[PDB]
Each structure stands twice: as structure tokens, then as C-alpha cells.
Symmetry: C2
Subunit: 195 residues, 2 copies
Amino acid sequence: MPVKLAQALANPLFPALDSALRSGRHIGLDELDNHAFLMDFQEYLEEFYARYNVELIRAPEGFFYLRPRSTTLIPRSVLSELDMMVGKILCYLYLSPERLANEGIFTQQELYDELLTLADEAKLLKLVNDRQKLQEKVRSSLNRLRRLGMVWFMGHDSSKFRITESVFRFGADVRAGDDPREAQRRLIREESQPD
Amino acid sequence: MPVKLAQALANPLFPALDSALRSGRHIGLDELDNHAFLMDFQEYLEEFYARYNVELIRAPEGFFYLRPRSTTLIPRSVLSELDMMVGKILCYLYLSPERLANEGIFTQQELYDELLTLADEAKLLKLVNDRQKLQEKVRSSLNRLRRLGMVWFMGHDSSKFRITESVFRFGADVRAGDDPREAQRRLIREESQPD
């Protein structure tokens, strides 16, 4: 192994960040130490994690994550369909023109209201067996998406949260200067992966 | 970091064994390369894994595993109550006087029959909502206990399996030359931990 790959593994930040990565957490800018850590050693941690048949991926929006190949040595898991939907609406909220002024801060109530109007009524209701049950499930997905590094809790509660640039993993594909919000709306209808 | 801690992490065995360890798998004698690997570097891998607030523990019966402290950086999980019971009966089967001659090989049918006679009828039946349903749940626990390194599948099926010395983690405490089998019978009535 190279010398500064050893300097990375020797850093007091690595065991906490290595575990977070292996659990599927996305490391955005808001974790400056961990983010700057992966910036200076990106070339070396890529080789290290490549030995687990996973790829340390830096998305074009600056955030890091591990993406496992089919032959990963770290067991993989998937987000539920409701969790995928909530993340997709979290990114619609991130695409909103107020996001710069609000710093990505939204309420669980704002997420409820966008979720009911933006999502297809037929499919969303088949993700339960109502609406106050759907609230406690949305709160469950947001805790899962907080663990993955998609939101930060503003308080001890899921009621106020800041959305992270890592939410772009739930965003459709866009180019030129097309409005990504309509593309997001049509889209809305161990290693835990958001696929 | 020390030089031969680097020789361990550089070994082509480490990423597969490191992942298996972090998932809670118990490394017994039957994995000779991985076992001999942890034998020659035990002093150095202890220090390495101690930085995740987990303890690389070698039980008195030769097998290795990671045991997380309350402040572990690797997320922890527990076995179900039925999985704990199946493992406890797997060790009762391991304590049997035929085990040396059979090399730890038992059938899923042998595990069913010992499970019904050895376990308390009132509690075991409250682990379902019958007996062919309990068979497919026993098969599920054995697949989980195989992942943890408690048994090896003799074939592509759970029908024939070899029990590992790591099963002693489900065994009661014994000293002098007392029969451990009666102590086992009274006992019968990310990091996944068998607690």
C-alpha cells in the first residue's frame, strides 16, 4: 500500500468515515472535515475501496458515496419504494427557487403537501394498507434518508430538516438550461443503495 | 500505523475477511487461510479494529469475531429470538457424543426433532402465528446462522449442514467436568450480534 493511503487510514477521521461510507452514507459539503478528507486522499481511497469491488464515486455536485459493483464484498441493500419517492420529492424541494434563500430548510409538513400533490394517487396509496399513517411512514423514510446523508435534522425531530446536495441522486437527467423541476415531476410518477 | 498491520491490510485476503468480520461472521478453523491470517496478525488487527470501538475477540475455542462496544462505529443488530434458539440447539447438537464421529454433520430434520423436544412448548409456539411454517422459519434461521459462520451447507440446500465450533457462542457456562448438555437443555428454556 502507498504511504499516504496509510496517512489516510491513520487519520482519526477514517474509522468513523469509513464506517459511514460502508453503510451507504453520502458525504456532502456540510461535513467539511470528512469532505475535505476525501478530497485530499480521493486518489488513494479509490484504490483502497476498489479492493472491496465497490467504487468511491464523487458525483458532479461534490458529494461522495460508495457504489457497489455486482461483485461487492460489502453486502448491499436497497431503499424501499416510499423512501425512493420521498428522496425524489426532497430533490424537487431542493430544485425550488427558494432553496438558496432558505438554505435547504423545509418542514415535514411541506414534504407532506408536496408529496400528495406531486405523486400519483393510485400508486402512493398502494404503499399503505391512512394519511396519519402515511405521515409516520414519511417520518420513517426521512430518518433513513438522514442516516444516508440526504437531510440533517434541525433539532431532535424530523419536523425541521435541511436538505443536502446529495439529494441529487434522486433527480432525473437534465441538460442545457432546461427546467429540472418538470423532469422531476414526471419522474415522481452494510451498503444501502438508493436504486 | 505499524508495518505489518500494513502487511495484513495489503494481503488479498483482508477485504473479504474484513467485510465478513464487520457483518458479524465468526471465523472458525474451517476457513484455514482466514483463520491462519487472523492468527499471525491478531495483535495488529486488534489495534486496528479497536479504532472502530469494536473488539476482535478470539473465544477459548479458537474462533474469531468482532464484538462491538456500546460506542461502536459499525452499526449493530441482533439475532431474533428464534435464531438464538436454533443456534442454542445447534450447540446442543455439537455437544452430542456422536459429533466427533459425524464431524458436526446434521440434518435439518434432526434439528426439527431436537427443537420440538428440547424447547418449551409454550414459548416456541408463540414465535409463530404451524409446524410446516416453523420448518421454513428454521430454514431461514439456518441461512442466517450460516452467514454468521455457525454452519456450513453440505450442498446447495439447508437440508444437510456441518456445525462449526463457533456455535459455542450459544452455550451456557460450564466448568470442571460437568456435562454441558444438561446446562444447555436448561438454557434452551453491519454487525449482527447473537445476544
